[PDB]
């Protein structure tokens, strides 16, 4: 039931409740890097990590959890 | 030469107006210092922009953009190279 | 009325809070964007204080009621 | 070195700012990209660094933050340039 930073890479140009706000940085040409904040119940912050970093072409992901 | 902050809402929701956004900005990609995304509500997305570079460049890419559709709210706030 | 502002200023880096992103724009000088989300009478009442006070450079306030 | 960019993130009860901001600043620096501050509460603020660098240099800035007295869950994620 905490707060958790989601990182992942994911090449920009081939085409909720849990967000707080999202970063987005061009690490090159290709991709971009996002770091997501997420807050909520940590059952279903890990869980919308998973997804996305399972997610195909979703590279480098990374969740750091901070429970309250 | 300078910075500058661009800012917008739009629906995230639609494929078809973000895809557009997207190649938009990666068309001028070394104007991007970092950007910011927050949930305003189930739709709309709002979006900060931060750049660097000719404040020339700066306003194409941000009215070009800017001008882009159902992109609301727009707003640029350039920041001068004479501090 | 609720709704969410976007506070931004340049400063030299020496309640309703979203997430805010700093940047150093120089040496000395350092960009700060604030989201802030909550009754906007308080809103742009903190931020009318913010860009008031002695340092706070460009202040810019644009605010996004709903 | 390697080059690349970087994900360093820690929380913090916002004399021990200006001492990370000595840190942030003063003995390593121009190697911030930008960084996202938010209030995890009435204490507590969580902070992602963005950098973007010489690999080395990034961790050893990191380990000056992290080092820190008071910085807990302190967390470096390199990104070397791909």
Avoid at 13 to 39: F, M, P, W, Y
Avoid at 43 to 56: L, P, S, T
Wanted: aromatic letters at 6%; hydrophobic letters at 40%.
């Amino acid at each position: 039931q905490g707060f958790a930073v989601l990182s992942y890479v994911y090449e920009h140009e081939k085409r909720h409740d849990l967000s707080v706000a999202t970063l987005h940085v061009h690490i090159n040409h290709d991709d971009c890097l996002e770091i997501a904040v997420l807050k909520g119940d940590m059952g279903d912050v890990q869980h919308f990590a998973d997804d996305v970093i399972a997610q195909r072409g979703v590279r480098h992901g990374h969740l750091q959890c901070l429970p309250k």
